[PDB]
UniProtKB/Swiss-Prot annotation:
This is Heat shock protein HSP 90-beta. It is found in: Cytoplasm; Melanosome; Nucleus; Secreted. Residues 1-207 are annotated as: Interaction with BIRC2. Induction: By heat shock. The chain holds residues 8 to 221 of 724 of the full protein. The gene is HSP90AB1. ATP binds at N39, D81, K100, F126. Residues 2-214 are annotated as: Interaction with NR3C1.
Amino acid sequence: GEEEVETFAFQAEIAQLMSLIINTFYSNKEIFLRELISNASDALDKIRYESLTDPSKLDSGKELKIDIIPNPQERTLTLVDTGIGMTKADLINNLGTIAKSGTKAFMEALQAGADISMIGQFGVGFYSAYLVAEKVVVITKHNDDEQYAWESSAGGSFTVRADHGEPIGRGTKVILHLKEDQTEYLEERRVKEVVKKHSQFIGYPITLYLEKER
Ligand SMILES: COc1c(C)cnc(Cn2cc(C#CCC(C)(C)O)c3c(Cl)nc(N)nc32)c1C
């Protein structure tokens, strides 16, 4: 009803990127974590910076953090930040619009012998989620907008709806529904090893949750 879903097509360039990400043979999948962590960090930087001018921007939650939560029984890995969040326009229009050129350069660079690990230099690392995820759900809440859920299982489309499930207050929760072959990422020990390798110096506390059972 009010949480009625609308389905949208990805920009052509982004659909091909995502296909390339899903169908290229590439073993170093763990780079997805660096990119999602990097995104969480920039969103937290943004809200911190804006809060300096206008401190009431933190009324929706003072704490600036990242939690990484592996759940084996649901086959999900979640990354939750208390960053700036995304508006409806961001999710439907602006993120796609901005990412076209990065996507097009990335693919050109791949043709010319760059590797998929370099996705972050092109501003489009979010889509490396599909190295490991069959489906990605993003819950997000920006100040003065309402909470939204974005979802996609690739194949060229995404859905956006109002989300009246549990309030996140402010931020983004990226829920990675992992592929059957990628369950190593549902163990804290693996997640820890990847965070130490690639994201040790992030300027926010990253709590790695321990799976309650394997
Ligand atoms: C819907 O899913 C996505 C898609 C399709 C593409 N990219 C991203 C990456 N991304 C982008 C975020 C943003 C923003 C808008 C500004 C920069 C104005 O805050 C943004 C934010 Cl605000 N937070 C996080 N964690 N990631 C973000 C996501 C999550």
